[PDB]
Design a protein around this ligand. Structure first.
Ligand SMILES: Nc1nc2c(ncn2[C@@H]2O[C@H](COP(=O)(O)OP(=O)(O)OP(=O)(O)O)[C@@H](O)[C@H]2O)c(=O)[nH]1
Ligand SMILES: [Mg+2]
Ligand SMILES: [Zn+2]
Lengths: 213, 69, 24, 263, 91
RNA sequence: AUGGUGAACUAUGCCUGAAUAGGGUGAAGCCAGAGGAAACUCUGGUGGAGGCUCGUAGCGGUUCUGACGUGCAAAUCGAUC
RNA sequence: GUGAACAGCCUCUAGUUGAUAGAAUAAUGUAGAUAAGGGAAGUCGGCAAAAUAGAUCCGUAACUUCGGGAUAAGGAUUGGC
RNA sequence: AGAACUGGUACGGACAAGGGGAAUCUGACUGUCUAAUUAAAACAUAGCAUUGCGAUGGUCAGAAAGUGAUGUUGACGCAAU
RNA sequence: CUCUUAAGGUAGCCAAAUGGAUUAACGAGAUUCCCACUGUCCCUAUCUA
RNA sequence: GCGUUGGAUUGUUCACCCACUAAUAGGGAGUGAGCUGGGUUUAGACCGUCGUGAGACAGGUUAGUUUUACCCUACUGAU
């Protein structure tokens, strides 16, 4: 019995990510003193297409408060932001499209994206192109906040966590039909080598638990 | 196992009282009626030893001459 | 026998059934 | 061999069905066997089946079964995997035989008929997939095969049969789907047949040949319209006629025989 | 003159791939390649390149937007949804 | 069974390089002319799109009662594709 | 130079003129040619060969996912001055 | 592009260069594979369908580990078909 | 315990233009034929390397 | 003694028909190394049947490499 394909992924020999041209790991700004007491102001310098991602990214800079320099961040672009637009970031930031805020600050009924699970981990939920969350409930008592995910699932988290106003740019990417295998070829060459897939029934009984007959 | 043991299965049916007439190749599938029915697709053969002396005749070929009174 | 209705069955639209093609 | 198919499947099957062309079931009744059915296998069944009902007008096939229910049960039917008619009446029909033959542990049914009638086709649209081989040519299935469904009812598909009656035809063997029309020697000479069968109006629409007479002339208007003429300047008599007679059998020209009148 | 009857830009795929899919793509790839008005210049100079990225030709200001049109309808109503939620908290 | 050596062949992903005559067809966009209130519909170009096509190099290896069967060759040679 | 052309073809510059030979012209071979009259009767089977072929112009059907089919088919032409 | 004139059995004169048609079955197609007997309807594909999972997670890896692949990832996604 | 046959004048009612997979295109895929064509053959002959 | 054919047909031909002719007699030793077509027949693939399955098959369909001679003898010609 030969070791089957999905078990052979666990080595990650060739199955790692094709990662030469990824612009940088998109995260939120580190949750620091200023963001948890006041706001701060940054500037998008440019937005750019990232290979292996439907969502375009955004190069936003901030001035370092603890030292004279400029440190640069990478955000996933909400739809409607333009170059040179200022972006406010903090607890005391106002609600405008593209700012990052705590969740406990907004009214419910708000539509945000790139939201943290636990506070501080720089944003792990609702990051695909055109997804988001909506805030459905504030429990100020033992402060929690209940929302609903793009999968339809509803989940409460802490009120301390962060997210950025508005939905991710790049919706409707999956509506266009790719029409031929070459575009499917140029898709997966940037992501990983799980393409093309040989069907399980076509293989031999050494290969896969379907094969034979 | 151990739930998939033929000992354990035949206790679950309560069919352990028979013993000496259980048939080779009986599974969770394939009752003893079925197994004899399946084996006749292969059992059209004769048996010879290393010599080869004819051990047991092929099916429906028993070659003896009956006394037809 | 089951009772058998013919209100269904759009019959096969041959070209000779169409008056769109005709001479005159 | 081709009748060695036939006595095999008749002796194999329990209930026989018998398909018939809706265009001219009288030309297809082929009695001849029913004779053998009544006299030697009284327990066997012999039901008729009218397939290809989508080639006749609506009331026409309606008139036929009234002239056919008096002797045989005779379902109407249209065979297609994806857009059929009358499947579930037959599915209701068969299981009764499996019901009535309770002890019999299973039951066969073989499909008898002329070639090129849909015997292979009907089984496919029963099984809702392609299991028999099918073709617009007549002699497509070559040897009977078991096709199992519901573990008790078995479908059998003999190749098509022509009874060896003297006459009863010479040319109307072309006017049933029997003969692969290619191997015939002079396809030019049977053209006034299809003038006699088909209606001039419906014929006029399918080409779209305007006024003619004298069916040799009818060919020569067409081969001009097809540009189907030989090198300087012979109009193709044969292959055009071969293209004509296919359409009479593949179902591109509309035709049928008038059913016997009510009284 | 009007060269094609009903395929237009989809005639570059010629015959293949089925007529239903080509009728979908023709709806999209016009919107992929059409010009659009700048909200900043005021000029019909907005162009996609590398979807999700929409630059005006003039003034080089560039708006992150939908993949095959500048603003999708989805964020368009989100804007006014925010506008409602903004001034409700303002008053 | 125990303990070892191999990806120069070949398989597959990645990195950085390199290579690919001349034809045929004529997508979108655009212009003109004629109609139409408009939508637009004709007519004549411009344009040079395509996992298009003819067809070298290149790659592949279909067909032949091929050649050769101690062959030049432990898979070559011809023509055809 | 020919020509649509790094094709095929023939020259220049440059480089080789190496592959055991000599003599005769049987059969059968290998490779390649030709044919009266007939035109697939051969053969399991048109296998193989023949036939077509560049460009200009005339003309072009059913079918169809309207994009094709399509060089459809079939015609008429081609020097030199 | 047109015309005279002219030789002729030849006028894309060698070289180069599609035979065509009617139909059926079959798989959509470009693709790919048994190096050395099989190039196909086999496989892959776009499309379609379904299941799984909100990270203290999914599917795997590792003798172990303060260990790894997906993952510089977050359901318009990943994984399984 | 009880039961299932009505449709008629050469193309129909109907359904949001069609009623189909009897699917275009494509293929060193499997197959039948027609024209053209010819040493495939009648029946062999001749020439060169 | 000498004669004893041409064909059509594989949805098959363990054959038949139609024609010529004097007539289309029946066999034997055959011609599996003279050549082949079907079939030895292996790996590929599809459909059907059966099996829980690997797979087998009541079948059916397609693609699929053995390659001598110079020796002894016979044989035909030759010294
Ligand atoms: N109009 C119409 N045509 C049909 C129908 N069913 C079959 N056909 C056509 O009839 C032809 C014959 O189908 P087959 O199944 O091959 O007929 P068959 O007699 O079973 O074939 P064989 O048994 O081999 O002679 C097919 O090519 C179909 O085109 C039908 O229901 N309606
Ligand atoms: Mg048939
Ligand atoms: Zn601008």
């Amino acid at each position: 019995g030969r070791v089957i394909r999905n078990q052979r992924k666990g080595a990650g020999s060739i199955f790692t990510s094709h990662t030469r041209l990824r612009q940088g790991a998109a995260k939120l700004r580190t949750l620091d003193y200023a963001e948890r007491h006041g706001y701060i102001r940054g500037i998008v310098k440019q937005i750019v297409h990232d290979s292996g991602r439907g969502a375009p990214l955004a190069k936003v800079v901030f001035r370092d408060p603890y030292k004279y320099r400029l440190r640069e961040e990478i955000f996933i672009a909400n739809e409607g932001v333009h170059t040179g637009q200022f972006i406010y970031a903090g607890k005391k930031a106002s609600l405008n499209v593209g700012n990052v805020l705590p969740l406990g600050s907004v009214p419910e009924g708000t539509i945000v994206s790139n939201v943290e699970e636990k506070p501080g981990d720089r944003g792990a939920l609702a990051r695909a192109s055109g997804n988001y969350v909506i805030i459905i409930g504030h429990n100020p008592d033992e402060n929690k906040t209940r929302v609903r995910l793009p999968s339809g699932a509803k989940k409460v988290i802490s009120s301390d966590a962060r997210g950025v106003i508005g939905v991710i740019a790049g919706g409707g990417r999956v509506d266009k039909p790719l029409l031929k295998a070459g575009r499917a070829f140029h898709k997966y060459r940037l992501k990983r080598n799980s393409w093309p897939k040989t069907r399980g029934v076509a293989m031999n009984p050494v290969d896969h638990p379907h094969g034979g007959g | 196992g151990t739930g998939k043991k033929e000992k354990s299965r035949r206790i679950r049916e309560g069919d352990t009282k028979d013993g000496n007439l259980r048939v080779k190749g009986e599974n969770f599938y394939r009752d003893s009626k079925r197994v004899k029915f399946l084996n006749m697709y292969t059992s059209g053969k004769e048996i010879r030893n290393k010599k080869g002396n004819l051990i047991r005749a092929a099916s429906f070929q028993d070659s003896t001459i009956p006394d037809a009174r | 026998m089951g009772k058998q209705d013919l209100g269904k069955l759009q019959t096969r639209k041959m070209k000779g059934l169409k008056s769109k093609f005709d001479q005159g | 061999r081709i009748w060695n198919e036939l006595y095999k499947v008749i002796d194999s099957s329990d209930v026989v069905i018998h398909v018939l062309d809706a265009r001219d079931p009288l030309g297809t009744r082929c009695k001849s066997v029913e004779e053998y059915m009544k006299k030697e296998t009284p327990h066997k069944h012999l039901i008729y089946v009218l397939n290809k009902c989508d080639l006749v007008p609506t009331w026409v096939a309606a008139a036929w079964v009234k002239h056919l229910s008096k002797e045989r049960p005779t379902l109407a039917f249209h065979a297609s995997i994806t857009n059929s008619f009358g499947k579930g009446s037959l599915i209701q029909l068969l299981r009764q035989f499996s019901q009535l033959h309770t002890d019999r542990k299973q039951i066969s049914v073989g499909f008898i008929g002329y070639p090129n009638t849909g015997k292979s086709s009907i089984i496919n649209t029963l099984r809702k997939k392609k299991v028999c081989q099918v073709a617009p040519i007549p002699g497509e299935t070559k040897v009977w095969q078991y096709i199992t469904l519901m573990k008790r009812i078995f479908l059998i598909d003999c190749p098509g049969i022509v009874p060896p009656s003297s006459k009863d035809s010479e040319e109307d063997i072309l006017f049933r789907g029997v003969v692969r029309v290619e191997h015939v020697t002079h396809p030019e000479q049977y053209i006034p047949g299809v003038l006699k069968r088909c209606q001039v109006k419906h014929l006029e629409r399918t080409y779209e040949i305007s006024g003619w007479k004298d069916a040799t002339e009818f060919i020569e208007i067409l081969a001009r319209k097809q540009g189907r003429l030989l090198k300087g300047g012979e109009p193709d008599e044969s292959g055009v006629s071969k293209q004509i007679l296919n359409d009479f059998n593949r179902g591109k020209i509309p035709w049928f025989v008038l059913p016997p009148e009510k009284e | 003159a009007k060269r094609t009857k009903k395929v237009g830009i989809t005639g570059k795929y010629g015959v293949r791939y089925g007529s239903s899919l080509r009728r979908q793509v023709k709806k999209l790839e016009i919107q992929q390649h059409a010009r659009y008005d700048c909200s900043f210049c005021g000029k019909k100079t907005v162009k996609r390149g590398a979807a999700g990225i929409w630059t005006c030709s003039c003034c080089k200001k560039t708006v992150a937007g939908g993949a095959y049109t500048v603003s999708t309808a989805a964020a368009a109503t989100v804007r006014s949804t925010i506008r409602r939620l903004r001034e409700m908290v303002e008053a």
